[PDB]
Amino acid sequence: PHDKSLDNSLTLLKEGYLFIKNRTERYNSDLFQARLLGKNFICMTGAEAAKVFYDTDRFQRQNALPKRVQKSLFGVNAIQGMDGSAHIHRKMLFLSLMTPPHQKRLAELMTEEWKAAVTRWEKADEVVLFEEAKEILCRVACYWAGVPLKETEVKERADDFIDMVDAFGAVGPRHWKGRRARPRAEEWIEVMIEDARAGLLKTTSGTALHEMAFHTQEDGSQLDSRMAAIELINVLRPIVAISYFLVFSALALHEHPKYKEWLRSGNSREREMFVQEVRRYYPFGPFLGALVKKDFVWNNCEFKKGTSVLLDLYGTNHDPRLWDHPDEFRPERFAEREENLFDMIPQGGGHAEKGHRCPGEGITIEVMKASLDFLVHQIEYDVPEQSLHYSLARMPSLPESGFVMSGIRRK
């Protein structure tokens, strides 16, 4: 099927997470063609398309997405744009820092921070969960990575990281805030990388700052200080970005009260199912870009070498073929469901060690579970009249008010 509009890029800006879905539904097909972001594109959705998208002998990420994305969210020529052994090699560096022990450490640091914040929250009239989450996550990420963070800069650094994330799907001022923040963060961290290499800043083996600073490539040389800052930033920024999920989770608890008592008398199992349903239900990761390496035929369609492709993440996560009542928030849908690396992909599909799948999934899950637990057992609060609406046409999305909590009290 072929969409002939000449304003698809603009249409994409207006539809956000619904661009692809609106069309895979209008053409009654898992894929379609279109001129987007200056190139010929094939958009596809579904778990099977996902399997094809993650087949590395047919798809490469090099030169896939616009530079405007590198200059804002990811950093220029970072791991997101790599392929082959070089990608795998650096991918192992990220994974070694995101294993169960690290996931555990971070969720526990987050847990002690949430508890310490209670004393402060009780005295406040209102609290904006999104802002609280940002600063706390930033403070934890840095501490855990071994990155020095002064009390008077937590706010600024936290905001810089968010400006980066909030700039990939926009034009105008939103994109510019990210375009300026990235340079401030990379510089801040590059000096750190350099002092560590000279032993002027204490670093600890096994921590992100250290590992990024001393990592060696396939040719045996270490990354340019700047690339090491970028790659370390590709660890700190994402963690801070967990803020959006934390807000969505709290919003799910408020929008679907029945589950509150459910989790409160349940265990780690209930929290795990609620946490998964939040990652599946709400929008965060839009879609991914890849480049067709060689000509191949799939689904009776021919993919020419060089054509660009977008894999719909939001849409696949809401595919009725995989999810009964996809558009309903139902944590119980996760009770006893054999794992599958392609049916749900809010943070990518496939194998993390074999492809570009997000290596921070475990951390994302454990931090959300820890944060959910805190909101369920540790405190009591009100959700005053506010705008909780979250647009599906804005990437990333977030409840307008950022989730405001008042009359907070320890439980």
Ligand code: HEM
């Ligand atoms: C907060 C929500 C998060 C979302 C929704 C998210 C989403 C994603 C997506 C969709 C990709 C691309 C997958 C692909 O290209 O196939 C990805 C990659 C990545 N994420 Fe996540 N992520 C998040 C959190 C985290 C955390 C907390 C960390 C660090 C602890 C992290 C580190 C990374 C890295 C390094 C990559 C690049 C991997 C590669 O290219 O091989 N992420 N993530």
